[PDB]
Amino acid sequence: ASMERFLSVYDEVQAFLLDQLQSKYEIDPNRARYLRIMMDTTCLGGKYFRGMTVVNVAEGFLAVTQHDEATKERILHDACVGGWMIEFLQAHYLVEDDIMDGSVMRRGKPCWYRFPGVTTQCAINDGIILKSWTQIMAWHYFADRPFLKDLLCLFQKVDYATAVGQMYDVTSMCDSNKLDPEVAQPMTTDFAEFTPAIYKRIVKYKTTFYTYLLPLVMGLLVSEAAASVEMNLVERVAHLIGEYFQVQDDVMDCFTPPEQLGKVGTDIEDAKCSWLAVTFLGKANAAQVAEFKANYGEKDPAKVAVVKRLYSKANLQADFAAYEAEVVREVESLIEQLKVKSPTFAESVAVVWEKTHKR
Amino acid sequence: ASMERFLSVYDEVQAFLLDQLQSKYEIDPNRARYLRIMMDTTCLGGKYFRGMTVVNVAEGFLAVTQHDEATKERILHDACVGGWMIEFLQAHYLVEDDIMDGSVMRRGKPCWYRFPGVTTQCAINDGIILKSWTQIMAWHYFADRPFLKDLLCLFQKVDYATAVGQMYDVTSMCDSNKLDPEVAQPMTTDFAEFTPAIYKRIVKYKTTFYTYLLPLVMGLLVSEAAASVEMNLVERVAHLIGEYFQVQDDVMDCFTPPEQLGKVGTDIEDAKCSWLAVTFLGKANAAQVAEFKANYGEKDPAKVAVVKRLYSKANLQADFAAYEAEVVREVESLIEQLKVKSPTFAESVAVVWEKTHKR
Ligand SMILES: c1ccc2sc(N3CCN(Cc4c[nH]c5ccccc45)CC3)nc2c1
Ligand SMILES: c1ccc2sc(N3CCN(Cc4c[nH]c5ccccc45)CC3)nc2c1
Ligand SMILES: [Zn+2]
Ligand SMILES: [Zn+2]
Ligand SMILES: [Zn+2]
Ligand SMILES: [Zn+2]
Numbered sequence: 001a002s003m004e005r006f007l008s009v010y011d012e013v014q015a016f017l018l019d020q021l022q023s024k025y026e027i028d029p030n031r032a033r034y035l036r037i038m039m040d041t042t043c044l045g046g047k048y049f050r051g052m053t054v055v056n057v058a059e060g061f062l063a064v065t066q067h068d069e070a071t072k073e074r075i076l077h078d079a080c081v082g083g084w085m086i087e088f089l090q091a092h093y094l095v096e097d098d099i100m101d102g103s104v105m106r107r108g109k110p111c112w113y114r115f116p117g118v119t120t121q122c123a124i125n126d127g128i129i130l131k132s133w134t135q136i137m138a139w140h141y142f143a144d145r146p147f148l149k150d151l152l153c154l155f156q157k158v159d160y161a162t163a164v165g166q167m168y169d170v171t172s173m174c175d176s177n178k179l180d181p182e183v184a185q186p187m188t189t190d191f192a193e194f195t196p197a198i199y200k201r202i203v204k205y206k207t208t209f210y211t212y213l214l215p216l217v218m219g220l221l222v223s224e225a226a227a228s229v230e231m232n233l234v235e236r237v238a239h240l241i242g243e244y245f246q247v248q249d250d251v252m253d254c255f256t257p258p259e260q261l262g263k264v265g266t267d268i269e270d271a272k273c274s275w276l277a278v279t280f281l282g283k284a285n286a287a288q289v290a291e292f293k294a295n296y297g298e299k300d301p302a303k304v305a306v307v308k309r310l311y312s313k314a315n316l317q318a319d320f321a322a323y324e325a326e327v328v329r330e331v332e333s334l335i336e337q338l339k340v341k342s343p344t345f346a347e348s349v350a351v352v353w354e355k356t357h358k359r
Numbered sequence: 360a361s362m363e364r365f366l367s368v369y370d371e372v373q374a375f376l377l378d379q380l381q382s383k384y385e386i387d388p389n390r391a392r393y394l395r396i397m398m399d400t401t402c403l404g405g406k407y408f409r410g411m412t413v414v415n416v417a418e419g420f421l422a423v424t425q426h427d428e429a430t431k432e433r434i435l436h437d438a439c440v441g442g443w444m445i446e447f448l449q450a451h452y453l454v455e456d457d458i459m460d461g462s463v464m465r466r467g468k469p470c471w472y473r474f475p476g477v478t479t480q481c482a483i484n485d486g487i488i489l490k491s492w493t494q495i496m497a498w499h500y501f502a503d504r505p506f507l508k509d510l511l512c513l514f515q516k517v518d519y520a521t522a523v524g525q526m527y528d529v530t531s532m533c534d535s536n537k538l539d540p541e542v543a544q545p546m547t548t549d550f551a552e553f554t555p556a557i558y559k560r561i562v563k564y565k566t567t568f569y570t571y572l573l574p575l576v577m578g579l580l581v582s583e584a585a586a587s588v589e590m591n592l593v594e595r596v597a598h599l600i601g602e603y604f605q606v607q608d609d610v611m612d613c614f615t616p617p618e619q620l621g622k623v624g625t626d627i628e629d630a631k632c633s634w635l636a637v638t639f640l641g642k643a644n645a646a647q648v649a650e651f652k653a654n655y656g657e658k659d660p661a662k663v664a665v666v667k668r669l670y671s672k673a674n675l676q677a678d679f680a681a682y683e684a685e686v687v688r689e690v691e692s693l694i695e696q697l698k699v700k701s702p703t704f705a706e707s708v709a710v711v712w713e714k715t716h717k718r
Contacts, residue, residue: 129526
């Protein structure tokens with residue numbers, strides 16, 4: 001099975017990275033063990049959706065393209081390595097974002113920095129190593145590949161867009177005209193920047209490039225199939241499915257039980273520009289807006305309870321149903337446009353959409 | 360002058376990065392201003408030794424190689440951009456290492472994370488952006504250069520070695536057999552790992568690759584002059600000068616006044632494996648070792664004063680003078696070996712050594 005091959009390549013990449021630390025970096029066995037545990041804890045335990053998208057896109061092309069068996073194996077192995085580059089990039093983001101946000105739990109366990117023998121002093125650097133490993137993988141496994149240059153260039157652009165997205169996210173509750181490194185930042189009082197367009201910018205950059213665009217395009221690159229699809233359609237469909245994925249995440253932060261979510265959601269206390277806050281402000285009357293302003297962005301559980309009640313009473317399920325219906329309609333139109341140049345790729349996009357919509 | 364051209368290219372690279380954030384990343388003017396201030400605060404104010412080494416190596420080759428004037432200008436501009444890639448890589452390290460170590464001051468001002476409108480939540484990500492900018496520079500300015508592939512591969516290897524070096528540094532006061540993410544780490548009691556070989560490993564990885572190896576080799580790459588020098592000699596001389604630079608830094612942390620140093624040195628309170636601690640343990644009697652163990656790695660200023668007195672009474676100046684004499688002798692031997700294939704490059708190495716030795 002595809003998942004089995006993907007998971008087997010993790011063990012191979014881990015062994016390569018750790019053996020290289022021993023043969024070239026004078027690592028000792030105890031530090032190699034620490035890094036092995038850090039890699040497992042930070043990289044494993046998710047659903048591997050991003051990495052598996054690379055594998056699925058490559059499998060689709062293998063079914064319609066003439067290749068020797070050894071070439072099919074090479075392409076699948078490259079798709080698995082590429083998929084792990086994305087999972088390790090995600091691991092870097094999660095480690096650093098958990099430290100930045102002072103998060104407590106992730107994937108049902110404590111955040112990496114909270115492990116007793118880790119601490120923030122080590123975890124920041126462990127996060128740096130996770131991203132460095134993505135490059136060591138690429139240069140080693142893809143050394144002689146025709147797609148190495150395009151892959152590294154794409155990966156770097158996606159990583160930069162993601163870091164810019166994190167900046168948009170962490171500053172989304174401040175007034176833009178007050179941003180100033182020299183002055184402590186107050187929370188917005190008018191919430192004028194909680195709009196659909198501003199929310200869409202945050203999400204586009206913080207999530208969609210690395211969660212949807214990069215796995216889809218990497219699958220095309222390892223398949224030598226990019227100059228067969230319309231890139232503007234790939235970007236449009238990735239940014240559309242990516243926003244829906246984040247909207248689902250935002251709703252879950254507020255209403256999915258901590259055991260199912262794997263953490264206690266704190267977007268309200270954190271004053272995040274979430275889909276729920278923007279949608280609520282898009283339909284609230286004057287008294288509801290005033291009540292939201294008096295309670296949002298506060299740790300006090302009674303204030304968080306007022307916000308959750310405002311959301312529940314505003315029938316945000318009706319807005320989500322209308323948003324969902326519109327996304328279903330636009331994703332299906334883009335898949336149709338994708339069929340003009342590639343039915344196989346349009347099918348992988350339909351799979352990606354089905355796994356997102358029904359998660 | 361060389362410095363003038365180098366500093367002029369900073370303004371050009373800054374404008375390119377910020378204009379790209381506006382034209383491609385939907386940045387707003389307030390966030391572009393925040394990033395401009397972050398870039399200036401974190402990248403400027405040092406001596407630019409690393410970036411200027413790239414420029415000096417390239418100038419040396421220009422003086423002995425036939426080129427059209429436009430080609431000389433292109434090579435110098437590439438050496439300046441490459442130099443800024445290293446200065447921005449250093450800026451990334453300093454931002455993250457100041458957060459990891461809980462440092463207070465850097466280059467005579469507060470550490471970036473301590474600025475009132477920054478905070479750790481933003482500063483970790485600002486540090487990530489600084490390194491992403493090094494890649495955006497390379498792909499933009501060096502898009503059509505023959506050396507792009509070698510330069511990116513070298514840069515990545517140097518960055519990874521540096522992150523591994525940071526891990527060696529932050530864990531240098533723990534016993535290797537006790538490292539365990541699940542268990543809070545006690546400080547060593549035996550100091551058995553405070554040896555010259557272990558100290559040399561820490562320094563080799565945490566400082567020498569990015570401070571000496573990368574600027575020297577990048578100068579060779581932008582000059583299309585690498586396949587003219589013996590790479591094993593370049594690595595040997597970079598690792599030798601780099602260790603001396605760190606030994607000087609270690610001595611300054613302990614004995615250079617806070618105003619000249621630009622910070623209050625805390626290597627003793629931090630229990631760092633410094634040249635001073637290793638050298639002291641290499642000559643101390645049983646009572647001196649016991650007194651060091653009772654006082655090292657503690658915040659108590661009276662305990663720090665006992666350690667500084669132990670160092671002063673141990674005549675570590677005599678050990679430094681012998682170390683220095685040996686480095687002078689070995690650096691001169693390596694420069695001689697470098698003259699076999701390139702007098703010009705051996706001269707740049709002599710300049711680099713003179714600037715390090717007499718800083
Ligand atoms: C899509 C978009 C918006 C929404 S709103 C939502 N709801 C389902 C659970 N309801 C009860 C509840 C569970 N936990 C709570 C905590 C506080 C207040 C109330 C509750 C609250 C509303 N479902 C969606 C789906
Ligand atoms: C190279 C290698 C080792 C050393 S040791 C050193 N010294 C110069 C200043 N001396 C006085 C001092 C200044 N500040 C202090 C604080 C506490 C105790 C004492 C002092 C202490 C010893 N110079 C070097 C140079
Ligand atoms: Zn976050
Ligand atoms: Zn969330
Ligand atoms: Zn440090
Ligand atoms: Zn120091």
